[PDB]
Subunit: 289 residues, 6 copies
């Protein structure tokens, strides 16, 4: 509902340590450019130069907070960005603003790109009349998942499982390793019967039926062509009405409406995190009025 | 030098701490799916399903080494990927293979994705007759710089400075803070006269002349149109022949040939790391004869 | 239904870090006692002097692997301990055996003490004909959760959710802060509709019906005397066949039969981790012959 | 002699680091329940529902300090707890209160459970006229020693050595490795030099005399029957009056008066940290008026 | 030219982490002495008892900020110390002052010792009519480089490169491994043509000419006799006027003037961080009036 | 006694973490020089070019072991170094040898420099007939205390207390804060009666008598002239035969005989760690076949 409340999801203690490692990565030793700018109190304007959705204020704020700077936002989390928009002002000693600048922009750009992709996907789906959830994956940049799942939520998608613990997800490789879908789904059920859910990844109707018989909570139809996707889900919903159907594999902004259908509850797209270009933001010091 | 030599640039201690933190990110508690697959010895085939350049073997290796798995590659680092290619084979306990799969794949996908954009840019420059350096920027994913700068090098681009400690770069914001170009360049030269180089980002020809007169090693012409860019660089090289000229701002694979010019030495592209989609890789367990 | 394979659940990277920090805590500087013992090859015996269930071999093994010692076990993980039993042999340099001894016994004692409480509780419950799950809680020693939740599993109990990122549980305090059960539960269901489960802690029959109406996967009947409990539950399963029922509040080894009932699916006991005395083990060096 | 002033023993850099790891353990990713409570200002009351001694206010405070919450205590550290007592009030944003609640109660229950067991021991020892030190052991939970040693002090017991540094302690296993008591405490005496004391665990009157002859400061008489313990301690003090005698092994709250004696200076019980059940506390949100 | 400005080079995140690691080294567990002093407000005066240069205020300040203490300086950074001077006053709880006393004095004493040695070398060089850069090396105490490089700057020396990332330095061993100087600097030149500098360490005029002819930005003449050093530099400056010339190897304050010469740009000295004795500072609590 | 045994004191968990932080300090990103040397197998000789005592082999081994290099020592830990001497060989890949070279030489140079100062102070006191202990202090480089305390031991000196959790030490500032010598030491005697030692730092003979009378184990006569130090030590020994006497403050190599006396038990010298120059070592790659 409200993109403004999503920030309560982020534990305060994780932000500070996350942010501290990013700052150290960009300046591990002596910050020679501090001598160029000096330490006088300054003001920068944050400028939106790309269209999209604003996501990332919590991480932007945390970065500058460790550098004793303050941020005033002129747009809420989740806003549509119409270029060229003035979206915040940052205040602090000049060398601190310029030290935090690059990391803060990198984070805002990337989080917002993901939310902009997610909002477009949510839009395309509703424009085909589909009421299910658009979702992300675990195809995230390592070390950056907290930012990328947050960005999905701001854009209106579900984050899907955060990590491997999680919901027990039986994949192709698990079926092979366990010697059969029925053995794998039985082993996944025991591993947390109460209460984690079990999702099972299925390359065909007959695997999906076997997964549902063995007790899957969710059935993921993997890499179906749309023309076989919907018949398969119809049979499933008629035979196992309380099992949820997820479609996934090669779904993009463009072909997404072909994968929306009344018997698909969830559509997950790797593109939301692997192919969402970053938005264009700049931070510019200006003289005080 | 040669793409296989590049792996030596990676300090093995940093590799291990990066890899461990990525794994703890994807599985911070219990790995319930390890019960589904068990620990029996298995083999998995790495498949390349996107065209491009293969980059990131050192990280893929270090991920799996930490889980006591081994990798045999069938293509060298920097190889062209012609899909559908069988790129490697991974060996080890089934649960260790499946626990590292996603992290390893996510790393290789983004690293290869960046190397693929760099290769594409170096190609576009060479086909325009340009012998300069195509270069990356500091617009990298927070936490992930080591992989992305490594990706740039495998693709044939220069990484540019690794962080704020490796070359004193006077930007528009330093100029405003310092009171002006020549004040800012003087403080930059002090801050490490011997010996770090000083690069100055300039938005006008006069700003470029002031910076070169003030002793900049490198003058970066920022967001010039090509029609304004090349006459500026010609003037600069005429008056200051030992000052290198860089061009940057809004340069993409498509417009890259318009910015090549006999008086440009470096061309830096934020897009090589911010808008380079990841390649598609899978890892499929295959049965024991 | 096999305690030897539970070790696969422990991610190897989390084990080594945890063990390192335990060894650092017990010896932060110089280890003066190493000079008293020297470094000659030697062997110790592990002695179980308490009845119960043996749990914690992977942690015990990991501690001594960091100290270049080897361990041979004479009883599989989960075995019944009949004192005074010779449980294992540890081999390595004398000072390394004696450096690991206290941390290894401390971990094994507590992991086995918890598994022993868990096994006794599970034994009580099937002796009353019960088929549901005996479970643990988040009343764990801070920083020791991985050992204590693993111990629950070794003794046959369910771990319940590992931390706040598993199933969304709304408690009395959430209901007070949301201003009502059905508000709380409706927010909970949004926060991850697909797919994490939602569990609601209820003090009174009315609350549980509200919770179930609103979409709870699980209702926890908290602090019921067994007199009200089994009516309450058989009502709920009548009205809501599809919703799981959990009993919690003051359930101990002595009174556990009185909470076992046929419409109760899960019984969780904070005593399994808060009042589970450690078993008594010792490690004794013995001479070669 | 003043439990309020013990909090100065805890260095504040360590407290924040330990507290951050505990919070990170209980919520490693997104905190979904935060969307259920919101962030509106709230107050919770701390209820003691158990008899004992109150211990652990600095850790409790430090947890809620990291979460931007305040604590008001109505009982000083060390007070007797008569249930059901209102111990404190915690103020702050509701999600912040609910995120720290479990870890704060977990820490206070264990700390207090220990200080309550210590105070019982000091009560029983005082009831037998014994003026020596009741002390703890190194049988603490790995990772938690700071809380548990502090809890021993709050309840009137001596902590004993914190770690493997501190006093050099010759044990059964050292005597085996060094080939005799004389050799082991001569090597110990050398390592200890002038700053550390030497204590020797002795299971017979012969060992105790050899240890005292070879310069031990303390002799620990290990696993003696009470009838054998007191003559041994007496003859030792006659022959070596400068040597402190400690008794230890199987000493419990019920049998502790039997081990008290005018020639025992220290009595140590693993019981106080390995078998002290945690006190019952709760934290309940309430409406301001 | 301003010692008070150098503090801006220190990124505040790194300061906190480094400072906390030093406090934890000196007090890993309980601070027993805190009971001896109590927590009442106190004041202590910092006393300089050595002649030299004051350096290290940012580290001294940061230690005491972590401990909720405040510092007031009566001398700016880089001041000349004429003993016995009263250079600062520290205010805070009694136990926090005494907790930080030793770490802060150890830090200030080494930093000021390095700055004193650097200023002595600069004064000797200036008394020989030399105005090039006196420079440090990477012969720093491991883990203490930020303090030691900072102290070189306060004293008037150049820090030289901070680590293996600042400038590619071809040493004797690189030459041997590369199979010759031409191959080495060619490879070095490739590692970062634009733009890091390449310095080559040379033991003969012929090696230096080759290093220069092959592209070196700086030539370091290592362990020359002054009699052969100055003719060598004169040749290099005449045939390669843009290449900087460094002298290094065995250069001490007492022999430094013989190494000063019109064609030496940089003189670097291991002894500035390896043979620089610390200064004597004390911190004495004082009372009301 | 035997310096070769002292390596047993070093817990290997701590060595790896220390060493990792030092390597990361010296190369936080890409190691450009690795491309100059390549990765082929190589060898380097370790030369001692300063007189003194060899100390720090375990830290040197650990550095290279982290880089997959092996070290062969030709002299034992603690040897007298008669320059020039071939101390060791190091083998491994060329770029790993050159990556560890500086950190490994820095650690060995400071460790050996400290041991050399220790051995000379021990010999000075032996030549004066004195049988007490020469001791170090806590005037140690922050972060480096393990190497420096270790270096003292290899030189034949006592380390004195490692940190604040060793013996409780009442200093001038503690006396001022407690309001009296004699209330200070009683607070200190409580803070760990059994069993840590109490040392009191005294400026006058009356102060020593009060510390002795209130129960100090050790009395440090701080900054006495030798003329008054020995009369004072004699009174104390006569009145308090079991109290040990330390002498400290301004004691150097050349006046150490003046502080030796029959009633001084310990002499401690800040200069052993604050004014002990590092020894000169070099590591030289040499070609094979
Ligand atoms: O591991 C997960 O949590 C997870 C959640 C949702 C989807 N996936 C997988 O992500 C893949 C998405 O494919 P794509 O083409 O959109 O990159 C598909 O193979 C799914 O099985 C994986
Ligand atoms: O800070 C650096 O290391 C750096 C190196 C090269 C380029 N840049 C900046 O990157 C910008 C180019 O970004 P883009 O997205 O327009 O390709 C340009 O404005 C430069 O100032 C920055
Ligand atoms: O937060 C959890 O994960 C959780 C899981 C299971 C149970 N609990 C709570 O644990 C409590 C059990 O109390 P007790 O007497 O068994 O210590 C009961 O009040 C439940 O609400 C809490
Ligand atoms: O290592 C220590 O610091 C230490 C301090 C005091 C006692 N102990 C040992 O702890 C044992 C007491 O265990 P318990 O649970 O039987 O009372 C006994 O064998 C002592 O030698 C060990
Ligand atoms: O690696 C560096 O950054 C570096 C910078 C400047 C000098 N050095 C080396 O330092 C050595 C001089 O140190 P010293 O103790 O002989 O005065 C000489 O051999 C140089 O090669 C090394
Ligand atoms: O704090 C310690 O553990 C410690 C141990 C031994 C000596 N000291 C102090 O070291 C000081 C002697 O330093 P110095 O530089 O004059 O040789 C003297 O003032 C003692 O109080 C301090």
């Amino acid at each position: 509902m409200d993109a403004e409340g999503l920030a309560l999801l982020l534990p305060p203690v994780t932000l500070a340590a996350l942010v501290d490692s990013w700052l150290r990565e960009d300046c591990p030793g002596l910050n020679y450019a501090a001598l160029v700018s000096g330490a006088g109190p300054s003001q920068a304007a944050l400028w939106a130069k790309s269209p999209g959705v604003l996501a990332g204020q919590p991480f932007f704020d945390a970065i500058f907070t460790q550098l004793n700077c303050q941020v005033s936002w002129f747009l809420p989390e989740g806003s549509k960005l119409v270029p060229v928009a003035r979206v915040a002002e940052v205040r602090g000693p000049a060398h601190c603003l310029l030290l935090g600048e690059r990391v803060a922009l990198n984070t805002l750009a990337r989080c917002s790109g993901i939310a902009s992709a997610a909002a477009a996907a949510v839009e395309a789906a509703r424009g085909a009349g589909w009421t299910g959830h658009v979702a992300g994956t675990r195809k995230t940049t390592p070390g950056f998942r907290l930012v990328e799942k947050y960005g999905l939520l701001v854009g209106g998608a579900a984050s899907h499982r955060y990590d491997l613990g999680g919901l027990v997800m039986v994949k192709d490789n698990h079926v092979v390793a366990a010697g059969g879908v029925e053995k794998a789904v039985r082993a996944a059920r025991q591993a947390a019967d109460f209460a984690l859910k079990v999702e099972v990844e299925c390359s065909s109707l007959q695997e999906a039926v076997q997964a549902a018989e063995a007790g899957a909570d969710l059935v993921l139809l993997d890499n179906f062509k749309p023309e076989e996707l919907h018949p398969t889900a119809t049979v499933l919903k008629a035979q196992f009405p309380s099992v949820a159907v997820e479609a996934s594999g090669g779904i993009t902004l463009d072909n997404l409406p072909q994968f929306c259908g009344p018997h698909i509850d969830v559509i997950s797209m790797g593109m939301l995190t692997q192919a969402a270009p970053a938005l264009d933001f700049s931070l510019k010091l200006f003289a005080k009025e």
